[PDB]
Amino acid sequence: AIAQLATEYVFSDFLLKEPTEPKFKGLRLELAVDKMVTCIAVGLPLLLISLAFAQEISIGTQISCFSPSSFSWRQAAFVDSYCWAAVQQKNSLQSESGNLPLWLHKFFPYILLLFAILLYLPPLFWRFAAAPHICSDLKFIMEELDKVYNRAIKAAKSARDPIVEQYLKTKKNSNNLIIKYISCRLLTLIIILLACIYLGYYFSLSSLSDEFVCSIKSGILRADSTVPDQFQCKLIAVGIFQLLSVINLVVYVLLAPVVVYTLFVPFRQKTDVLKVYEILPTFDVLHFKSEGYNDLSLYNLFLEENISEVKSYKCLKVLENIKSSGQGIDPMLLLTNLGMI
Amino acid sequence: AIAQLATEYVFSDFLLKEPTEPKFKGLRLELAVDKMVTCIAVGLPLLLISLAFAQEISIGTQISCFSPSSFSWRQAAFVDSYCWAAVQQKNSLQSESGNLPLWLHKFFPYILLLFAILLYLPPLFWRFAAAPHICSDLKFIMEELDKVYNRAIKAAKSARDPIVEQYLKTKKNSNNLIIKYISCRLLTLIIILLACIYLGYYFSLSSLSDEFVCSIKSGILRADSTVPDQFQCKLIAVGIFQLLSVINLVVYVLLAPVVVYTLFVPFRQKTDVLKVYEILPTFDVLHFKSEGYNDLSLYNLFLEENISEVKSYKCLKVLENIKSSGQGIDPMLLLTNLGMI
Amino acid sequence: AIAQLATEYVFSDFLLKEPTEPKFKGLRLELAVDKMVTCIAVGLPLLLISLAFAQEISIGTQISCFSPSSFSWRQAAFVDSYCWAAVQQKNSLQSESGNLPLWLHKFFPYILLLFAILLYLPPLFWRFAAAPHICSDLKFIMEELDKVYNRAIKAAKSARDPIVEQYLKTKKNSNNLIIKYISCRLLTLIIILLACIYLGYYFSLSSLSDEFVCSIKSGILRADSTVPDQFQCKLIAVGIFQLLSVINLVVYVLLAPVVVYTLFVPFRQKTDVLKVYEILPTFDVLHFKSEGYNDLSLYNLFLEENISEVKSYKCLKVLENIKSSGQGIDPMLLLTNLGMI
Amino acid sequence: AIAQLATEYVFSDFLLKEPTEPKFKGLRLELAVDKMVTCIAVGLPLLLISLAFAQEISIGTQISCFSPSSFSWRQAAFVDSYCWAAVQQKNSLQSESGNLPLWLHKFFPYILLLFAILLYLPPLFWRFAAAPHICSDLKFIMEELDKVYNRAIKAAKSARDPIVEQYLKTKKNSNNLIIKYISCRLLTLIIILLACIYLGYYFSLSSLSDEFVCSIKSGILRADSTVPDQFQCKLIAVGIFQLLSVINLVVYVLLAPVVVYTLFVPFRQKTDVLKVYEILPTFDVLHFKSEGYNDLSLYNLFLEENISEVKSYKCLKVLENIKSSGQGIDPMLLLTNLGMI
């Protein structure tokens, strides 16, 4: 049913499943925009494949060939099957457009699924090659961040009564994690552009290329005179393929700019979460995180992403907002907060 | 079966699934009226698509073409398939109404599903872009609210024996959350109006536009004299489409006023929950929450929504009701309550 | 299978599913008679729809038209499909009863499902609009009730060795909850009466209205002389529809008095649970709950319903029964009970 | 459906299921590259088998034989069935290419599944023969490693206020675990090369080898003159087999170099995790793990793999990175860490 495909591929959490493992519990490891780009770019061709053969659009078989009236039911079935298998053998069939459109019309579902798989590959390589490293580092950085905030509030309360920073400075040096990231993004962009080219070509087909003339006259049927010289076959469901092909092309050409934008990782590093903790006195008062094609920018993005899960950040952010209001003071209201755990 | 679709799409919690995650446990993040508007506007076209092809309304195929009696079974099948695929190729078919109604009759399920997806998009953007921010803020505000009530009752009991307010004042300034909200609501309204226009057009079709004349005379069949010049084809299940189209149009034109009403976020801010805590002496005695196209109004709505889950509010509300009765006193009965946790 | 439908729709807890949420755990929020009225009034048309197309009653298609013997298999299929789609187009078909019975015979399942949905709507509005308010209030009232009993037994034991009442007095004033309740009940009664009228009309159809004469002579077939002027079509499964229609009408006309009886909410307030606690000295010795079209009567009904879950009520009730026996004394046996938790 | 196969065989965790047992919880026991090599090499032929008979590529039966028009429906069915069963009996059928291509065309799915099973066997032998030994040893080594780090930090803190090494030296001697490992890898490589040879042969078939002449003239039909001497049969879905055969060959010839690379187990031992603990004073300052076709190299690889799960390693690694930054000192920041458990 058309509605079941809808549920399964848009309304269900298809490819939105969190890692079924206690190792990554609430850690994202994939920027939300990357997750949605992958979800669209991969699930859309699958949904389109499923729609192209929905029982309420499909009339029946994919090919029909109009045998003579003298032919029995089984002879007509033979003609259909032979011509279907003969879209490959170029000698038997004669079409105005050529054989390549016939190939493309027969194997449209396979090509769309191939594009889905190729678009799924780079996210897989990211999830299996570079995800655990950043998961461990980000989790450790968040724990140390919490410890730093605890030290600051403990010092403030005691007055009333930077290992993580250096690790960040270290990550500022290496660029393994960023070349991996932009390589997956670049491959996604390349595959999306190749898919756009292919779909634009396919939609541009003559729309009469689904009609080809086929001849079952190889072998001993060559001498058979009860068999006409050639049959008029038509590939049903090519119009559906071309309509779905233009839909896919529209979505992919809208999606490509998003991938290109993600390609600029430093530009996206904005709304510095580190600034909030920099407001705290104990932590060094510097952003110390921007302006480079280095793993530090990646870690900044992933910190902005997974930073909402730590309650210490939440408290410090609301304190910074009150500072924007500018009514009280940071240490007094922080001691009033009482949000250590 | 018709009853299975009924269960699945009205009696099951379809699109009423709470977030399967410990991050949002009992926090709504979507106003009930918005949830029901989305549920209707999205599930209704899906239920209608499923009904239009229920096995007890569907007679069989979607098209039938009345080949000559001389035609064999397979030749008639060829005619049906060719004309079905030929509702796209405008040269072959000749209809009194035109080709656009034929296109619309073939692809009615796809268009309804497209409307379902487009109506599902704005709630998705809300759930993924702006939901976590408000979830964290609302949860923190409720925790701080409980702490304020605990301080008030502790002071009262001790006599017997405003960080959250400033955060609210801060939210009164920014308008990111409200422009996001009214943008999703406005897109929902725009898509619903476009869908109403389309369905009103479709239901207005001639009801004889499902009869078209089709001609399988391209290619080598042009010289074929055993093939009549043209066939009388009829698109079955167009009457069902038009009946379901008017049902959908009725529901959507009833739904549009609800969306417009939700568009006025300040007007909906009523029955101030903040007033109850304002009755408490320790908290500032002011509503300090109304009258603006600012994130404060949104937070007021979401507070009214998720406010029942905190037991402290429940106790203070029953105390306010007793005040409406006006028998005892607030602090004495509050100390009698003993509802700290 | 007929037995699977039986299990699913009578023997399973269909629409008897308790709220899958920790917010309402054991709280009913719907009077048992209302639950059964909704279950019947909604599930019966669905079960009837499923039965009308059970594989052991259905002979095959829904319509058959008796084409001439000269017609091929596919021409006969065209005739069936055309006439099926032509029960809408009034110009083609000529029936003795009219076109409205033909419409009604084709769309009987849809009309029954429409009635099921309309009857499901008022319980949905109750469950989503007014259920949480009463859930919170009733739960709080029960907790306070338990606290009052604990205070009474503690005072009695100490001798050996009314916030909830005022909240009840407050609820005696407002009438929002009761107008909502009687509005849902009144809409259920109105829809049930409209459904009874429709089913009584439908069962009164001529029983020969399923035979109509149909003519496939529009378009180019008008000039076709191999096509007879008109065909004798018959809508199979109309007798089944009418039999199931009278079954549904019988059940609904038996159900309407039950809805009317529920409409008198004060009359149903009986066997005062408050009287038991009134027997206790510490609580005020008054029922203080009856005789009004006010939310207090609703709360009385829901208290009588959800009152069995509190063990304190159970103990006090057995003490009251012993008082009916009149052997010992209330405080002594209450202290002997030892049922604080 | 083509999309269901996609989900099941690429997007689901097919053969990525962690051991459903509390014995191995988070221990990998299979290097990630080996896991992906097995997953590809085994799941690809299964996905290809499922695709070759997808309902949207399959026209119908696998063979059709073009009986005379005089033949009834059942006689034609007999011809199809006889020739299908007669691709084995070499006497009846006469083909230009020979009988071996006919055998190969009939049993292509079975051969692909045979390759899948043979490629699944070596990982099974590894999982059942040698996995528990290394699981127990690695887990014990990690526990002892943690104890060594705890002793070092305890000594450092006390100043402020090698059983696992010898087991490693012992493992440096035996070579049972490494000959088992390279034997499974070598069998995987051998089977992959044999499969590549077979698929390259199969794709090189004449593409007209699917047309064979078949004769139902054994037994009493020999004297039957109503039966023609021979029939023209065609094996449909051979073009699909050859296309999928070249896809499989491409993937396997890309996969073989990966297996060969895994075959060099010492070369892969890189980024010594032991070096980090060697930086600690209490542990012996030596890698003492490299350069041999001995079980020590295997244990090094598996240690690098399962080493992220121990938090002690994480702390020591970030300390080593800070040493790379060279700001503070190892013992002071280690005592500051406070990551014993």
Ligand SMILES: CC(C)CCC[C@@H](C)[C@H]1CC[C@H]2[C@@H]3CC=C4C[C@@H](O)CC[C@]4(C)[C@H]3CC[C@]12C
């Ligand atoms: C990502 C964006 C740029 C994609 C836009 C679609 C492009 C790639 C499409 C749309 C129209 C297409 C062209 C239409 C017709 C022809 C003529 C043919 O003999 C060769 C291919 C060629 C030249 C196509 C190449 C691809 C094409 C240019």
Ligand SMILES: CC(C)CCC[C@@H](C)[C@H]1CC[C@H]2[C@@H]3CC=C4C[C@@H](O)CC[C@]4(C)[C@H]3CC[C@]12C
């Ligand atoms: C949301 C509300 C306003 C929707 C009401 C339905 C409207 C949009 C429908 C109902 C009748 C429809 C009209 C019926 C007939 C025609 C004539 C045709 O040649 C052009 C379209 C046009 C002019 C339609 C436009 C859309 C229409 C006006």
Ligand SMILES: CC(C)CCC[C@@H](C)[C@H]1CC[C@H]2[C@@H]3CC=C4C[C@@H](O)CC[C@]4(C)[C@H]3CC[C@]12C
């Ligand atoms: C979803 C949105 C786009 C729907 C908008 C309404 C669509 C479905 C309908 C409503 C009225 C329709 C128009 C009515 C009449 C004509 C004149 C004709 O000579 C060309 C098509 C054209 C111009 C139609 C195009 C499609 C149209 C605009």
Ligand SMILES: CC(C)CCC[C@@H](C)[C@H]1CC[C@H]2[C@@H]3CC=C4C[C@@H](O)CC[C@]4(C)[C@H]3CC[C@]12C
């Ligand atoms: C709830 C109770 C009262 C329902 C009882 C069934 C009633 C509503 C049924 C039973 C018989 C029915 C009548 C039978 C025949 C006709 C004649 C027709 O030309 C108009 C409708 C009319 C007049 C029907 C109206 C509805 C009807 C009166």
Ligand SMILES: CC(C)CCC[C@@H](C)[C@H]1CC[C@H]2[C@@H]3CC=C4C[C@@H](O)CC[C@]4(C)[C@H]3CC[C@]12C
């Ligand atoms: C792993 C790599 C090397 C695989 C490459 C494919 C190889 C094995 C394939 C491709 C072409 C194939 C050849 C094509 C044609 C013939 C002629 C035939 O009479 C005997 C087999 C023989 C000689 C095939 C042997 C296998 C072959 C050489």
